[PDB]
Amino acid sequence: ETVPVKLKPGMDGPKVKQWPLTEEKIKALVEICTEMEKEGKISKIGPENPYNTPVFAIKKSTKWRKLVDFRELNKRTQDFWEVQLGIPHPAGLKKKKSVTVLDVGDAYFSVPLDEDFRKYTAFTIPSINNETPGIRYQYNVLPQGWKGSPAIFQSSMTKILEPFRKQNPDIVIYQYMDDLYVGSDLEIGQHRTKIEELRQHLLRWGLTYELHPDKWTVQPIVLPEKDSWTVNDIQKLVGKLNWASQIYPGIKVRQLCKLLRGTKALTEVIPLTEEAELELAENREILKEPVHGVYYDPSKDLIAEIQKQGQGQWTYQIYQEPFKNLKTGKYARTNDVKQLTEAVQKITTESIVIWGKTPKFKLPIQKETWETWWTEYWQATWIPEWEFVNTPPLVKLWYQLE
């Protein structure tokens, strides 16, 4: 019994080119796909299918997994999965002491895919040195990575979760793409026991970290505590504070600006005044608490900006309106691309938990470096949207830590 899927009028299916893959990754995919074809999950296709979606091989565990990039198909089917069959996001999930993430993607293999939508799921296995044309396939069942799969499957998911929910009314379960987010206020042993219990319920239907969102405390803009302050240090502080006033309402800086008078050497020691120190502390107390006036608009896209701080640390901010930060934070711990990949997954997970949406990333890296290498370290079953930026020299300074 198939659910009919429709694209937005005038919008055609994805025609996205395939990235060159290493021999190892091609072999891994040929073997995976040979088996899915044997099981009737996918079928070899003809040239009459002009559509294409990229395919990659990750590790996620020492076993190769197939990752399909449905980013384009998702944007094109947005109406179906968001308004026609939207999965509501629970506001309580972010409040729980422990959230466990379980992959449920293997559930989609059971449900067949609307015969007229199948062509849009086309993908190619490339060939080294263009020896052969690629191996082409399309899906016969709900695919892993397409937002329409949990949308269709949510009625089947409700039946599976009905007993477990009824017996644990204070346990929040949320489905995002191929994953199940399970939150509780139970002790870590009890929580881990209830997860194992839940896996048993899933096991009867063919379905086979933790995060601590209550412990998610945003990194405030940090102002230094010092004995002696130079001209250079006050200049650095006014710079940092002048910018914070764009975000935080009620930041004063005139008492600090007052100290900087005349053409002076940067190294020269300047003594603190009573009102400058009061201004310094009043701003210090503001940055502690979240920014007043900033609220999530469910109709707007989320954006995430990341800065490289050196020494294995990375800072990030999530907003919908530039500088109107919904969340700020940091990531720590070799390799710049590996570390960046890691931060991207962490920020995305936090956004799925807090708003039920992945953010659009502004990455401080070259398109080509990122495209060649991100798949060597990627472990998530989803892929967020990204773009490449040239980090402003000062934004890094203003978001620094200690």
What residues between 128 and 157 interact with other proteins by CB under 8 A? 128-134, 136
What residues between 360 and 379 interact with other proteins by CB under 8 A? 363-366, 368-370, 372-373
Asked if 337 touches other proteins (CB under 8 A), the answer is yes
Asked if 23 touches other proteins (CB under 8 A), the answer is yes
Sheet holding 172-176, edge to edge: 98-103, 179-184, 172-176
- Phi/psi for 183 (5° steps) reads -110, 140
Report the amino acid identity of residue 354: I
Nearest to 78 by CA among 11, 156, 178, 159: 11
* Alpha carbons 364 and 391: distance in angstroms, whole number: 6
What residues between 39 and 58 interact with other proteins by CB under 8 A? 46-52
| Of the candidate residues 2, 18, 168, 255, the single one contacting other proteins (CB under 8 A) | 18
Asked if 345 touches other proteins (CB under 8 A), the answer is no
| Of the candidate residues 340, 347, 352, 383, the single one contacting other proteins (CB under 8 A) | 340
| Of the candidate residues 11, 20, 269, 385, the single one contacting other proteins (CB under 8 A) | 20
Asked if 393 touches other proteins (CB under 8 A), the answer is yes
The rounded Cα 112 to chain-centroid distance in angstroms is 28
Give the CB-side neighbour count of residue 132, counting CA atoms within 13 A.
8
Which 3 state secondary structure label does DSSP give 234? helix
Interface pattern 89-128 for other proteins (x via CB under 8 A): ---------------------------------x---xxx
* Alpha carbons 50 and 302: distance in angstroms, whole number: 32
Asked if 400 touches other proteins (CB under 8 A), the answer is no
Tell me the window of 58-66, 154-162, 234-242, 274-282 that interacts with other proteins (CB under 8 A): 234-242
Asked if 339 touches other proteins (CB under 8 A), the answer is yes
Give the CB-side neighbour count of residue 237, counting CA atoms within 13 A.
27
Number of residues that bind other proteins (CB under 8 A): 73
In the complex, minimum distance from the CB of residue 154 to other proteins, in angstroms, rounded to a whole number: 31
Tell me the window of 55-63, 101-109, 204-212, 334-342 that interacts with other proteins (CB under 8 A): 334-342
Cβ-Cβ contacts under 8 Å for 165 (sequence gap 6 or more): 171, 173
What Rg do the C-alpha atoms of the chain give, in angstroms? Answer: 25
What residues between 59 and 78 interact with other proteins by CB under 8 A? none
In the complex, minimum distance from the CB of residue 19 to other proteins, in angstroms, rounded to a whole number: 9
Residues forming beta bridges with residue 100, ordered by sequence position: 182
